Design a protein around this motif. Structure first.
Motif, PDB file in Angstrom:
ATOM      1  N   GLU A 123      27.903  35.148  -2.425  1.00 49.80           N
ATOM      2  CA  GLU A 123      27.519  36.468  -2.960  1.00 49.80           C
ATOM      3  C   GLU A 123      26.012  36.636  -3.073  1.00 49.80           C
ATOM      4  O   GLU A 123      25.467  37.651  -2.651  1.00 49.80           O
ATOM      5  CB  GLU A 123      28.159  36.726  -4.334  1.00 49.80           C
ATOM      6  CG  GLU A 123      29.644  36.641  -4.272  1.00 49.80           C
ATOM      7  CD  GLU A 123      30.332  36.929  -5.598  1.00 49.80           C
ATOM      8  OE1 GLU A 123      29.648  37.053  -6.656  1.00 49.80           O
ATOM      9  OE2 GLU A 123      31.578  37.019  -5.553  1.00 49.80           O
ATOM     10  N   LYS A 124      25.353  35.629  -3.623  1.00 51.30           N
ATOM     11  CA  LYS A 124      23.888  35.597  -3.655  1.00 51.30           C
ATOM     12  C   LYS A 124      23.288  35.741  -2.256  1.00 51.30           C
ATOM     13  O   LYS A 124      22.305  36.456  -2.058  1.00 51.30           O
ATOM     14  CB  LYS A 124      23.401  34.298  -4.310  1.00 51.30           C
ATOM     15  CG  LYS A 124      23.270  34.382  -5.813  1.00 51.30           C
ATOM     16  CD  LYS A 124      22.468  33.181  -6.341  1.00 51.30           C
ATOM     17  CE  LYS A 124      22.033  33.351  -7.772  1.00 51.30           C
ATOM     18  NZ  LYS A 124      21.437  32.082  -8.289  1.00 51.30           N
ATOM     19  N   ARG A 125      23.863  35.074  -1.263  1.00 53.94           N
ATOM     20  CA  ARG A 125      23.349  35.217   0.081  1.00 53.94           C
ATOM     21  C   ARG A 125      23.467  36.664   0.562  1.00 53.94           C
ATOM     22  O   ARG A 125      22.530  37.229   1.123  1.00 53.94           O
ATOM     23  CB  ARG A 125      24.087  34.303   1.047  1.00 53.94           C
ATOM     24  CG  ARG A 125      23.710  34.533   2.489  1.00 53.94           C
ATOM     25  CD  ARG A 125      22.223  34.175   2.721  1.00 53.94           C
ATOM     26  NE  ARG A 125      21.752  34.558   4.049  1.00 53.94           N
ATOM     27  CZ  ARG A 125      21.051  35.665   4.312  1.00 53.94           C
ATOM     28  NH1 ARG A 125      20.745  36.530   3.356  1.00 53.94           N
ATOM     29  NH2 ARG A 125      20.650  35.920   5.539  1.00 53.94           N
ATOM     30  N   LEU A 126      24.635  37.257   0.349  1.00 54.31           N
ATOM     31  CA  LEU A 126      24.928  38.571   0.902  1.00 54.31           C
ATOM     32  C   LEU A 126      24.069  39.621   0.183  1.00 54.31           C
ATOM     33  O   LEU A 126      23.691  40.593   0.784  1.00 54.31           O
ATOM     34  CB  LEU A 126      26.429  38.911   0.797  1.00 54.31           C
ATOM     35  CG  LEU A 126      27.388  38.161   1.733  1.00 54.31           C
ATOM     36  CD1 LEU A 126      28.811  38.459   1.331  1.00 54.31           C
ATOM     37  CD2 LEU A 126      27.168  38.514   3.199  1.00 54.31           C
ATOM     38  N   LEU A 127      23.759  39.396  -1.090  1.00 54.41           N
ATOM     39  CA  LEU A 127      22.923  40.316  -1.865  1.00 54.41           C
ATOM     40  C   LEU A 127      21.446  39.922  -1.815  1.00 54.41           C
ATOM     41  O   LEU A 127      20.636  40.516  -2.503  1.00 54.41           O
ATOM     42  CB  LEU A 127      23.371  40.352  -3.340  1.00 54.41           C
ATOM     43  CG  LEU A 127      24.814  40.832  -3.612  1.00 54.41           C
ATOM     44  CD1 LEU A 127      25.143  40.836  -5.090  1.00 54.41           C
ATOM     45  CD2 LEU A 127      25.007  42.217  -3.055  1.00 54.41           C
ATOM     46  N   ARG A 128      21.116  38.905  -1.020  1.00 55.43           N
ATOM     47  CA  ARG A 128      19.740  38.423  -0.872  1.00 55.43           C
ATOM     48  C   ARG A 128      19.104  38.129  -2.225  1.00 55.43           C
ATOM     49  O   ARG A 128      17.960  38.457  -2.463  1.00 55.43           O
ATOM     50  CB  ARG A 128      18.887  39.438  -0.082  1.00 55.43           C
ATOM     51  CG  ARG A 128      19.415  39.700   1.328  1.00 55.43           C
ATOM     52  CD  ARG A 128      18.588  40.711   2.138  1.00 55.43           C
ATOM     53  NE  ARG A 128      17.144  40.471   2.045  1.00 55.43           N
ATOM     54  CZ  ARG A 128      16.220  41.087   2.788  1.00 55.43           C
ATOM     55  NH1 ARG A 128      16.576  41.979   3.712  1.00 55.43           N
ATOM     56  NH2 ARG A 128      14.933  40.798   2.618  1.00 55.43           N
ATOM     57  N   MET A 129      19.859  37.486  -3.100  1.00 54.37           N
ATOM     58  CA  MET A 129      19.410  37.148  -4.436  1.00 54.37           C
ATOM     59  C   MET A 129      18.908  35.708  -4.551  1.00 54.37           C
ATOM     60  O   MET A 129      18.700  35.203  -5.654  1.00 54.37           O
ATOM     61  CB  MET A 129      20.583  37.313  -5.396  1.00 54.37           C
ATOM     62  CG  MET A 129      20.966  38.761  -5.690  1.00 54.37           C
ATOM     63  SD  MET A 129      22.550  38.839  -6.551  1.00 54.37           S
ATOM     64  CE  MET A 129      22.343  37.651  -7.885  1.00 54.37           C
ATOM     65  N   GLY A 130      18.758  35.028  -3.428  1.00 56.30           N
ATOM     66  CA  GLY A 130      18.115  33.727  -3.445  1.00 56.30           C
ATOM     67  C   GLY A 130      19.052  32.541  -3.498  1.00 56.30           C
ATOM     68  O   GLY A 130      20.249  32.644  -3.197  1.00 56.30           O
TER      69      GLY A 130
END
Length: 226
Positions: free
Chosen positions: A120-127
């Motif tokens: 999810e972090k990857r897909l939302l570019r949250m690091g």
């Protein structure tokens, strides 16, 4: 009945529906949804904004069935061939309990850490993943695996003698974690054996073919031997 499944490939809820439909040999067309982007048009299908959504069309009349609680019970009620809930009230109760176990407890204690920090972090570019969150998810996962292992040493399938929606729920959830290489199958022999058997069924084949851009699965993900 025409069936269209609006889903996200690496969603455990979506995968449970794909397994049930496949196992019942019910054809469907698929529409992939990047639901985290909240595409207006999907929220008009389902006000929660979440997949899966199964649209059943008959004589140009649509039945829009949203999310697994409604979808799985609908499928089992309307298409008996073969049954994914047992006939004995005890087996039905145990399978449904395990649906809730995975959809709520496993989802919260494992997915909320392992899937959140990685996919999810990857897909939302949250690091990058929070390493402590990951360690917490991995320990929770080991506790859930131990639980299912204890069941599977005393029963053929998770809910008893007959393969059921409970097996597909547990396998759907584990299959996504497996795509990201996080399931320690080697430590849970009955669970490894059970998953190997499920993974070889026709219904599983499309799920093993899932790929999403930027998210490269573990090498063993689609191997029948692992």
């Amino acid at each position: 009945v025409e069936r269209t499944l609006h889903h996200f490939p690496l969603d455990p809820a979506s995968r449970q529906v794909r397994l049930a439909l496949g196992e019942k040999r019910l054809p469907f067309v698929e529409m992939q949804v990047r639901y985290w982007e909240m595409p207006p048009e999907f929220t008009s299908l389902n006000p929660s904004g979440m997949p899966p959504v199964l649209v059943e069309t008959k004589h140009q009349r649509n039945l829009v069935i949203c999310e697994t609680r409604a979808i799985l019970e609908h499928i089992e009620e309307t298409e008996t061939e073969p049954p994914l809930l047992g006939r004995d009230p005890a087996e039905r109760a145990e399978a449904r309990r395990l649906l809730q176990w995975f959809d709520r407890k496993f989802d919260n204690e494992v997915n909320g850490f392992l899937l959140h920090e990685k996919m999810e972090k990857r897909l939302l570019r949250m690091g990058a993943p929070d390493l402590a969150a990951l360690r917490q998810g991995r320990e929770a996962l080991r506790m859930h695996l131990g639980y299912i292992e204890s069941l599977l040493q005393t029963r053929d399938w998770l809910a008893g003698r007959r393969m059921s929606l409970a097996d597909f729920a547990a396998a759907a959830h584990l299959s996504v974690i497996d795509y990201f290489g996080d399931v320690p199958w080697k430590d849970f022999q009955a669970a490894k054996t059970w998953y190997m058997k499920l993974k070889s069924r026709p219904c599983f084949r499309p799920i093993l073919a899932d790929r999403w851009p930027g998210l490269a699965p573990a090498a063993h993900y689609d191997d029948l031997d692992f």
